[PDB]
Amino acid sequence: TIMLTPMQTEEFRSYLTYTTKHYAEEKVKAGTWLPEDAQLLSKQVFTDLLPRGLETPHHHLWSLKLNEKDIVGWLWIHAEPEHPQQEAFIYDFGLYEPYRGKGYAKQALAALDQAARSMGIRKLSLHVFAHNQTARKLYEQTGFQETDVVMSKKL
Amino acid sequence: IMLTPMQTEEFRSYLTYTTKHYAEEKVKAGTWLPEDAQLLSKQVFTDLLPRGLETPHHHLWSLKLNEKDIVGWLWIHAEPEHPQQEAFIYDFGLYEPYRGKGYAKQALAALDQAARSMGIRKLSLHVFAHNQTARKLYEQTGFQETDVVMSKKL
Amino acid sequence: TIMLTPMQTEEFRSYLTYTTKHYAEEKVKAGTWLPEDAQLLSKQVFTDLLPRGLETPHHHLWSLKLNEKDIVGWLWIHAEPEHPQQEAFIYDFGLYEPYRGKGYAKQALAALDQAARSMGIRKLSLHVFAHNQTARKLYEQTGFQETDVVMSKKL
Amino acid sequence: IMLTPMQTEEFRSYLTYTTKHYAEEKVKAGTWLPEDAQLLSKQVFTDLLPRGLETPHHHLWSLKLNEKDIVGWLWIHAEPEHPQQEAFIYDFGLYEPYRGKGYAKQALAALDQAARSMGIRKLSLHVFAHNQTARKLYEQTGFQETDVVMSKKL
């Protein structure tokens, strides 16, 4: 039973730091960004997405909580209610390392499902790096279907 | 817009939005303290709907906009022996994505048709004073004020 | 939120009556039993399945309850813990007429899922008359897959 | 039999069985009144596991019989600074379909291996007096009685 609770400042400034570095690394892993460019790019991307931080309009950043004491992870979605399909995009989702491997991830996505419906959103979307097969299987197991695929080849 | 018997899962979603919304509304209105709001809201809805969708004389509909699209809710209570055949609108609204598109007036017209068909001769409702847009709407659709509650902080 | 509560005597003797008649009718609808034979057959079948009624060993008869006041339906499963696949068979499942068309059926099957796992059963099975397409779709929507199909033709 | 870190969903199932089972056991034992049992059981488990699977120093495993088959549970509490490096077995059992197949003794042997690996030097447990088979098993696996509780109705 995961609850979605508005992310608080401390957790957010800590999250922001992890994300930027993690995103940079994933883009390097994927071949999309060169190591020497990754930092500045990642910082630019997160700065354009959340220029007002938690106050950035239409972004919902939540702490995933098991109870008052355990924050097991994070969830960040973007929903503009003027979207023709009432779609929300998951910009990020994950579990802090000590809470992984117990199945909270599926429970958190069910809580997302519920919250999303109560907000009137009709469709959830996300991007998932290709090399993250574990994330891919969980999304498959939870009703997500692949829509687009970007492929690459070094000559 | 069509009124459809509310479904158990549509009810779960409705309850998740409203409960929180009703609390904030009660806070804005000065009626409830913030530390208390969430728990009071929960207690109100359980008191009003002890048997959920089965609570006798309560009629909960989902507002459907097409055969596949759900946009809002409408819940009215009607004592079948009420001397004025009056129904009270407990909750009525639309999820954010569908506001400002005319659905509210269409939903009210649907309620009018549904009420006449059910033997209902009068409709009543509560609205928070701070909801100017809802008030204007109800005014435009024939509702008249009957009671006001006023308050002041000393 | 449906709860499974042990069916009580009054509800059971009322249920038993409905079931026998309903089963007879379904067998006639399906072409399996002739109208003139249906009653006695149905009675024989239920008498062999539940000779001790609620006390019949390995049968679990439950009232589906929304709250203290509403009994929305029934559920009857058979589970012998010595089964090699730890399988339980749903002998009957349905909703009283005033509680239909609100989606309780899926919620009741989720409650079945939970209860079954806590009992250690690993597989659920059921028979569904072919002409009951509405029941068929719900079972499909809830993870059930067709395993066997009996077909017939009058010459 | 293998011990696997209990999964949140395996925990939901475990809690559904145990809670009810513990109550009946407390009733049989004369400790709890039937009207009270269910609610006391629920309160016990929340008191013991306030943070669920995250409650510090508690180790909950699922008992797996093959790479794909779950048959039982094992939950022990071990204070990392306990002077005797003692662990207390709070709950241990098998779902009905897998009893009487030797899994219990294999599970106890697995716990022994797991405990030595974790620095645990002593195991303790509670068992209801009326559970002759569990008592016999524990006796056969090296456990000795240390305390008894007796009662009488006047």
Side-chain angles (χ1 to χ4, degrees), chain B residues 49-64:
Chain B
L49 263 14
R51 295 169 63 193
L53 293 160
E54 306 305 317
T55 308
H57 307 326
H58 287 259
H59 302 93
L60 297 94
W61 292 292
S62 275
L63 305 180
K64 206 170 277 176

Side-chain angles (χ1 to χ4, degrees), chain A residues 104-119:
Chain A
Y104 299 133
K106 296 208 178 179
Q107 303 186 348
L109 293 169
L112 174 55
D113 181 87
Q114 303 184 339
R117 307 217 188 206
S118 77
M119 296 175 63

Side-chain angles (χ1 to χ4, degrees), chain A residues 66-67 70 72 98-99 102 104, chain D residues 51-57 60:
Chain A
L66 205 58
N67 50 68
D70 298 280
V72 312
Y99 298 100
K102 299 186 204 77
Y104 299 133
Chain D
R51 295 169 63 193
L53 293 160
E54 306 305 317
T55 308
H57 307 326
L60 297 94

Side-chain angles (χ1 to χ4, degrees), chain C residues 25-139:
Chain C
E25 299 177 345
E26 297 286 272
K27 288 284 205 174
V28 170
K29 213 136 91 62
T32 300
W33 287 355
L34 286 188
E36 304 87 10
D37 288 318
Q39 197 157 230
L40 166 59
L41 285 169
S42 193
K43 187 67 176 180
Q44 283 176 3
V45 158
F46 286 103
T47 285
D48 293 1
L49 284 177
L50 305 173
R52 295 211 273 142
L54 290 178
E55 302 297 314
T56 304
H58 308 315
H59 288 268
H60 302 89
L61 292 85
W62 286 302
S63 287
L64 303 175
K65 295 190 184 184
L66 205 58
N67 50 68
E68 313 85 5
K69 192 71 180 184
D70 298 280
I71 298 167
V72 312
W74 59 94
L75 176 59
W76 166 14
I77 75 164
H78 171 61
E80 190 208 1
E82 292 271 286
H83 194 282
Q85 288 182 270
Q86 295 83 219
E87 161 185 53
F89 192 84
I90 302 160
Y91 269 107
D92 196 8
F93 167 57
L95 299 189
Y96 295 105
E97 192 147 67
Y99 298 100
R100 300 166 195 193
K102 299 186 204 77
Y104 299 133
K106 296 208 178 179
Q107 303 186 348
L109 293 169
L112 174 55
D113 181 87
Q114 303 184 339
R117 307 217 188 206
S118 77
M119 296 175 63
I121 95 99
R122 304 199 326 167
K123 173 178 175 154
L124 287 164
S125 300
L126 54 89
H127 163 278
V128 60
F129 286 103
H131 57 268
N132 284 331
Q133 294 247 23
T134 295
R136 291 176 72 181
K137 295 202 228 64
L138 164 80
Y139 291 144

Side-chain angles (χ1 to χ4, degrees), chain A residues 17-126:
Chain A
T17 296
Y18 143 96
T19 298
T20 298
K21 297 187 185 184
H22 178 79
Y23 197 59
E25 299 177 345
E26 297 286 272
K27 288 284 205 174
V28 170
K29 213 136 91 62
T32 300
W33 287 355
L34 286 188
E36 304 87 10
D37 288 318
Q39 197 157 230
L40 166 59
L41 285 169
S42 193
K43 187 67 176 180
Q44 283 176 3
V45 158
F46 286 103
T47 285
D48 293 1
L49 284 177
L50 305 173
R52 295 211 273 142
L54 290 178
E55 302 297 314
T56 304
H58 308 315
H59 288 268
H60 302 89
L61 292 85
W62 286 302
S63 287
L64 303 175
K65 295 190 184 184
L66 205 58
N67 50 68
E68 313 85 5
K69 192 71 180 184
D70 298 280
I71 298 167
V72 312
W74 59 94
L75 176 59
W76 166 14
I77 75 164
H78 171 61
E80 190 208 1
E82 292 271 286
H83 194 282
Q85 288 182 270
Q86 295 83 219
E87 161 185 53
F89 192 84
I90 302 160
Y91 269 107
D92 196 8
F93 167 57
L95 299 189
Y96 295 105
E97 192 147 67
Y99 298 100
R100 300 166 195 193
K102 299 186 204 77
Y104 299 133
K106 296 208 178 179
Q107 303 186 348
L109 293 169
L112 174 55
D113 181 87
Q114 303 184 339
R117 307 217 188 206
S118 77
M119 296 175 63
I121 95 99
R122 304 199 326 167
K123 173 178 175 154
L124 287 164
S125 300
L126 54 89

